[PDB]
RNA sequence: CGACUCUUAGCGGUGGAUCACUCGGCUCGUGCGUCGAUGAAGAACGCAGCUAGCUGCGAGAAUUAAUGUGAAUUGCAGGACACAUUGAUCAUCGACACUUCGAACGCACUUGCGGCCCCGGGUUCCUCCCGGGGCUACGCCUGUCUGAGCGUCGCU
RNA sequence: CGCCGCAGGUGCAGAUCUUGGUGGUAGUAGCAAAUAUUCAAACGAGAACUUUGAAGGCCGAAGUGGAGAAGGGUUCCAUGU
RNA sequence: CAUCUAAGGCUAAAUACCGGCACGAGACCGAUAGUCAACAAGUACCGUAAGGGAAAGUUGAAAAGAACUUUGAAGAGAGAG
RNA sequence: CGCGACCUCAGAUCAGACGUGGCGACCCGCUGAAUUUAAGCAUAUUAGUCAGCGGAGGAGAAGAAACUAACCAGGAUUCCCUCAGUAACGGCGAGUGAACAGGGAAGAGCCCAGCGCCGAAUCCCCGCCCCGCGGCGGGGCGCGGGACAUGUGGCGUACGG
């Protein structure tokens, strides 16, 4: 369990930090698992969700193998919007349904120089831990 | 008559706004604030009213300078320095 | 806050309670009455080698 | 009002005692803080005794305690004089010195100078410059034989 | 089409002031369009131009201040804003030199009787 | 009165400007919790401090 | 001495406090002189003072002041102590020789009132109820 | 027969108890232990495209720069942003900036009025007008300059 | 939540108790100081009360008139509901 | 006889800490409780002033916050969703 | 009957500095009640407390004996345990009330004036050059100013020198 005297385990303090988190650490909170194929190709498990990467919904009403491109990362409401994950409201217009990124699986990563830099950063640390415990 | 009739005659203000502390306690005829005692150099403050003290103590306002002091203390009040350019 | 939260117990009585607790932890009836599922345990003063 | 047999009690609680109450909830934290400071000090003075300077043998004053011997504030100037130790060099080599204490008798005076001679013989003096040992101590006596003494230096026993 | 601080820094005072003037006439035009209806595009450019004016003025004031620091470097007396602003109490403290200088009596005591490093055997 | 100082007139100006309803788009903000301006002041109901 | 400053000598209370005249200030006149010099010269540190003369109605003292920010004081040890912030307005806290004489400080049986540093230091220690964790 | 009244139950109202929840307190402990004439605390007035409060900020005004981060902010709109001839946002914050009162400092204030020195314009240097900038508080230390005294003296 | 222990800010009908809510009273008292209204029309879903017109009255220049000081602070003025 | 050497000065540590900055915890309270303040709270409001000083938490997983038809001038309904 | 030296004073928007005000839980200096208890009440108590005023710091104050003791003597200050609800005070009523020794936390010592000696050996300021800017120092120079014999610095302080 936790032994750090400067890290809190208080429920009120943790919920306060979660719901009042600045958007640059809301990015890390809103991470998603990678698929088994991506988790093999890159030696990483999780990844912060991004505006242009493709996910599957694995929990809830919109479960399935349909690959949807993320269209909006609404960090204020801790949800993401995906292409076909939507419903008609009363007047007949479509509205996106917000889904927590922890309930999706990233299948294709929107790649740029920063994403590859983070991906190799996470992989190198994992390899260091593997060879430390080897 | 001391009741309703006498209330009609009051139309001259005893107090006005105070250029220090901004309260409507500046006695015009005495030229003294009844809350801060403005023409006196020292702020009017009494320990028999702890409730009045916490209404106007440090922290109830903006702390434009003290907020920066509390931040700068954490790095030893460093000056004349810049983060290393990228 | 000055409610006397703490109690002091005699060292001889605290030593006594340890002796009673150790002695009771050597009897299968008392340990099972705590509910410790010692049914296939080979011996109840269960001692293992130092390699542990 | 008194009731039957009892003791005439006079509590001293007529003086607004509740505004001055010292609780001791910081006692375990104070013991930790003192212990940490003791450990930090011992690390600071690396081979020197962790307790501090050596204190003299002292007889307790009154007729209740004159059969008892404890540790005093510092060695008197007459004791250092006949032990051959300068009163300003003594403090630098870990000997406490009390310039205001006199010696009324020769038994206590001679017992403290035997104490100083024994300490001076037990003392390992590191050279001021480790490369050049001038008059301090042989390198064999300080290579590994120098450890931090714990507890009072030569504790006073009855 | 924007302005950045980094590429403003090589410019000279005249062309920095000219760029400040052009942003100021555009901001006044935007405030005109605000009170005459205008468009959402013109209304949203108000903040962009306002930040641009702040950007130019920050670079102007930084360049001027850094030149004045260089000019007064090594001089005995400096303007108060160029002096360090640590804390009123920290500015009243003894400086590093006089905090550490000793009397001759103290110097002899340290020279004659330095604290020795010693150990005591059990 | 008609005769007023500049400080009094400026104080009355700020009191006038903040005596307006909340914008309607405030009510659509995330985690709003604000229904209406509770600091509305009517000239006849509540008199100003000065 | 110190006349009690009450209107018309009325000290509304029990007879033991009816005194108006024959009352005495707890600090000496020399200490009052140092306080008046220090308050006027708030930028200087009072060091000591001495007696230079008196008549029926006046006492005269001469107070030694030090400018803490003069270089002849800053650059000299053995007088750098007066420049430390803990030594500003010594005369107003009874830290001068005249001011300290009225505090009852001393060593031995005659000065048990001030063990702990002051009378209030002694009073607090003697009037605080020590409630340990284990009673 | 109805009405009315009473009792009980079903349902519906009125009301907001109970229970469950908790980004709040209270208590204890720890480590630091830092304001101000280089203008504090406090107050006033302003500042957002749509903004009243709260919050943030000071005419560079819901923020500039720098650094870290690395694609958002979001209620709506608008518009950027090759993320490499560098970057949204957030955080940090060491550069810069920081209106008016206020110890508050030219004098004074429930108003207002000076003086001195430079710069620019009408002048087209001479001092009038307009604008801009810098000064102009009290106490006090060291030194400086200018002085006063039928104070003590010296030379004439 | 039960059982074995432990610890309480541990049990309400009252305190002209505290806070909140709700009855009967009760569709009751009342909406009675300063003479007074009426006809037609318009707008409007709707008119004793609004507007216009026509009458009959009142203030009667120490006014129920026209303007100010203090105080108020936008109540001023249009448009709409 | 003993004991010190006044009327000048400095000095860390152990000690204190219901204000401040930043943390951790609890056999505490759980929206009439706990801070007055869980919320635009020293706010609204009251007093000439010194000063006094509240009430006020909860849709839902997601606004998916009831399109459309119908009566009514609307509030408000009946269907539908 | 002018010019100087000094002394004692004055002015300046003179050159360079410093103080003011806030917070105030803890700390230092003063001032300082009454409710209350005494089953009344005046001394006493509350209490050197509340309120009032002033001054600080990260701690403050205190502090190296004009001490304790009476011993086979201890040895600055501060804090804890104990002494001790004791010695003592008190309408000897109600009530109040320490210290020494002992055990611990910590532990650290010193500096002037004076008496003397040393060609004032001393210090501040302003210029110039150099090394550096960081809490502005060093080094050198100035028949450059001032302070200072109405006493600066070195030695030295009761433990003697
Ligand atoms: Mg009356
Ligand atoms: Mg009047
Ligand atoms: Mg000397
Ligand atoms: Mg009215
Ligand atoms: Mg009495
Ligand atoms: Mg019901
Ligand atoms: Mg930036
Ligand atoms: Mg006037
Ligand atoms: Mg003369
Ligand atoms: Mg109860
Ligand atoms: Mg009840
Ligand atoms: Mg009726
Ligand atoms: Mg009627
Ligand atoms: Mg008539
Ligand atoms: Mg009229
Ligand atoms: Mg109107
Ligand atoms: Mg509450
Ligand atoms: Mg409830
Ligand atoms: Mg209606
Ligand atoms: Mg000047
Ligand atoms: Mg009585
Ligand atoms: Mg009674
Ligand atoms: Mg009575
Ligand atoms: Mg007080
Ligand atoms: Mg102060
Ligand atoms: Mg001190
Ligand atoms: Mg002292
Ligand atoms: Mg001595
Ligand atoms: Mg006993
Ligand atoms: Mg007493
Ligand atoms: Mg110890
Ligand atoms: Mg001398
Ligand atoms: Zn005021």
UniProtKB/Swiss-Prot annotation, chain B:
It is found in: Cytoplasm. One of its GO terms (molecular function) is RNA binding. Its main location: cytoplasm. The modification N6-acetyllysine is found at residue 9. SUPFAM superfamilies: Zn-binding ribosomal proteins (SSF57829). PROSITE patterns: RIBOSOMAL_L37E (PS01077). Zn(2+) binds at residues 18, 21, 33, 36. Transmembrane segments: none annotated. The keyword Cytoplasm applies. One of its GO terms (biological process) is cytoplasmic translation. Keywords: Acetylation, Cytoplasm, Metal-binding, Phosphoprotein, Ribonucleoprotein, Ribosomal protein, RNA-binding, rRNA-binding, Zinc, Zinc-finger. A zinc finger (C4-type) spans 18-36. One of its GO terms (cellular component) is cytoplasm. Component of the large ribosomal subunit. The ribosome is a large ribonucleoprotein complex responsible for the synthesis of proteins in the cell. HAMAP family: Ribosomal_eL37. Belongs to the eukaryotic ribosomal protein eL37 family. Component of the large ribosomal subunit. This is Large ribosomal subunit protein eL37. It comes from Homo sapiens (Human). The gene is RPL37.
UniProtKB/Swiss-Prot annotation, chain C:
Coiled coil: none annotated. It comes from the Eukaryota. Citrullinated by PADI4. It is found in: Cytoplasm. Component of the large ribosomal subunit. The ribosome is a large ribonucleoprotein complex responsible for the synthesis of proteins in the cell. Belongs to the universal ribosomal protein uL4 family. Component of the large ribosomal subunit. May bind IPO9 with low affinity. Interacts with RBM3. This is Large ribosomal subunit protein uL4. It comes from Homo sapiens (Human).
Curated annotation (Swiss-Prot), chain D:
GO terms for cellular component: cytoplasm; cytosol; cytosolic large ribosomal subunit; cytosolic ribosome; endoplasmic reticulum; membrane; nucleolus; nucleus. Higher levels of expression in benign breast lesions than in carcinomas. The modification Phosphoserine is found at residues 51, 76, 105. GO terms for molecular function: RNA binding; structural constituent of ribosome. There is a cross-link at residues 122, 144 (Glycyl lysine isopeptide (Lys-Gly) (interchain with G-Cter in SUMO2)). Signal peptide: none annotated. The keyword Hydrolase does not apply. GO terms for biological process: blastocyst development; bone development; cytoplasmic translation; translation. Component of the ribosome, a large ribonucleoprotein complex responsible for the synthesis of proteins in the cell. The small ribosomal subunit (SSU) binds messenger RNAs (mRNAs) and translates the encoded message by selecting cognate aminoacyl-transfer RNA (tRNA) molecules. The large subunit (LSU) contains the ribosomal catalytic site termed the peptidyl transferase center (PTC), which catalyzes the formation of peptide bonds, thereby polymerizing the amino acids delivered by tRNAs into a polypeptide chain. Component of the 60S large ribosomal subunit (LSU). Belongs to the eukaryotic ribosomal protein eL13 family. It is linked to Spondyloepimetaphyseal dysplasia, Isidor-Toutain type: An autosomal dominant bone disease characterized by early postnatal growth deficiency, severe short stature, genu varum, platyspondyly and severe epiphyseal and metaphyseal changes in the lower limbs. The gene is RPL13.
Curated annotation (Swiss-Prot), chain E:
Component of the large ribosomal subunit. The ribosome is a large ribonucleoprotein complex responsible for the synthesis of proteins in the cell. Its main location: cytoplasm. Changing residue 76 to N: In DBA19; uncertain significance. This is Large ribosomal subunit protein uL29. Component of the large ribosomal subunit. Transmembrane segments: none annotated. It holds the Pfam family Ribosomal_L29. Keywords: Acetylation, Cytoplasm, Diamond-Blackfan anemia, Disease variant, Isopeptide bond, Phosphoprotein, Ribonucleoprotein, Ribosomal protein, Ubl conjugation. PANTHER family: 60S RIBOSOMAL PROTEIN L35, LARGE RIBOSOMAL SUBUNIT PROTEIN UL29-RELATED.
């Amino acid at each position: 369990m936790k032994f750090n005297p400067f890290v809190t385990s208080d429920r009120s303090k943790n919920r306060k930090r979660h719901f009042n988190a600045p958007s640059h650490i809301r990015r890390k909170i809103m991470s998603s698992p990678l698929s088994k194929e991506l988790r093999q190709k890159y030696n990483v498990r999780s990844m912060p969700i991004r505006k242009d990467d493709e996910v599957q919904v694995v929990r809830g009403h919109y479960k399935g193998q349909q690959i949807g491109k993320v269209v909006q990362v609404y960090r204020k409401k801790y949800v993401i919007y995906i292409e076909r994950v939507q419903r008609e409201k009363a007047n007949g217009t479509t509205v996106h349904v917000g889904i927590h990124p922890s309930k999706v699986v990233i299948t294709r990563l929107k790649l740029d120089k920063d994403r590859k830099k983070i991906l190799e950063r996470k992989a190198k640390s994992r390899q260091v831990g593997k060879e430390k415990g080897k | 008559t001391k009741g309703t009739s006498s209330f009609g005659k009051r139309r001259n203000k005893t107090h006005t706004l105070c250029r220090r502390c901004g309260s409507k306690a500046y006695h015009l005829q005495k030229s003294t604030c009844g809350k801060c005692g403005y023409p006196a150099k020292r702020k009017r403050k009494y320990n028999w009213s702890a409730k009045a003290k916490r209404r106007n103590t440090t922290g109830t306002g903006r702390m434009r300078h003290l907020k920066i002091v509390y931040r700068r203390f954490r790095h030893g009040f460093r000056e004349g320095t810049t983060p290393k350019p990228k | 806050t000055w409610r006397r939260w703490h109690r002091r117990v005699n060292t001889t009585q605290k030593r006594y309670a340890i002796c009673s607790a150790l002695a009771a932890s050597a009897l299968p009836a008392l340990v099972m009455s705590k509910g410790h599922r010692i049914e296939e345990v080979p011996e109840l003063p269960l001692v293992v080698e130092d390699k542990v | 009002a008194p009731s039957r047999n009892g003791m005439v009690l006079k509590p001293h609680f007529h003086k607004d005692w509740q505004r001055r109450v010292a609780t001791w909830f910081n006692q375990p934290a104070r013991k930790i803080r003192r212990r940490k400071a003791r450990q930090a000090k011992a690390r600071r003075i690396a081979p020197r005794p962790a307790s501090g300077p050596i204190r003299p043998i002292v007889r307790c004053p009154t007729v209740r305690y004159h059969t008892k011997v404890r540790a005093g504030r510092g060695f008197s100037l007459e004791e250092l004089r006949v032990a051959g130790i300068h009163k300003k060099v003594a403090r630098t080599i870990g000997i406490s010195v009390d310039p205001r204490r006199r010696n009324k008798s020769t038994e206590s005076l001679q017992a403290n100078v035997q104490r100083l001679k024994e300490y001076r013989s037990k003392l390992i003096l590191f050279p001021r410059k480790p490369s050049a040992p001038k008059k301090g101590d042989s390198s064999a006596e300080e290579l590994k034989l120098a450890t931090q003494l714990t507890g009072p230096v030569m504790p006073v026993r009855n | 089409a924007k302005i950045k601080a980094r590429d403003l820094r090589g410019k000279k005072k005249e062309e920095l002031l000219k760029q400040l003037d052009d942003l100021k006439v555009e901001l006044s035009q935007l405030r005109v369009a605000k009170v005459t209806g205008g468009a959402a595009s013109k209304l949203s450019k108000i903040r962009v131009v306002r930040k641009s004016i702040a950007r130019v003025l920050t670079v102007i004031n930084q360049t001027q201040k850094e030149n004045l620091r260089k000019f007064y470097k090594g001089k005995k007396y400096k303007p108060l804003d160029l002096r360090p602003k640590k804390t009123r109490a920290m500015r009243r403290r003894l400086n590093k030199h006089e905090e550490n200088l000793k009397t001759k009596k103290q110097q002899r005591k340290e020279r004659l009787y330095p604290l020795r490093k010693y150990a005591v055997k059990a | 009165s008609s005769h007023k100082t500049f400080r009094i007139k400026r104080f009355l100006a700020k009191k006038q400007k903040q005596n307006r309803p909340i914008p309607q788009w405030i009510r659509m903000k995330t985690g709003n919790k604000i229904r209406y301006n509770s600091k509305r002041r009517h000239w006849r109901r509540t008199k100003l401090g000065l | 001495g110190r006349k009690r400053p009450v209107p018309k000598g009325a000290t509304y209370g029990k007879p033991v406090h009816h005194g108006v005249n024959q009352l005495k200030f707890a600090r000496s006149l020399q200490s009052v002189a140092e306080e008046r010099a220090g308050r006027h010269c708030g930028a200087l540190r009072v060091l000591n003072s001495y007696w230079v003369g008196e008549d029926s109605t006046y006492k005269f003292f001469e107070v030694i002041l030090i400018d803490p920010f003069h270089k002849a004081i800053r650059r000299n040890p053995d007088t750098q102590w007066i420049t430390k912030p803990v030594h500003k307005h010594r005369e107003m806290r009874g830290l001068t020789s005249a001011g300290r004489k009225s505090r009852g400080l001393g060593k031995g049986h005659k000065f048990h009132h001030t063990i702990g540093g002051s009378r209030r230091a002694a009073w607090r220690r003697r009037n605080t109820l020590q409630l340990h964790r284990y009673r």
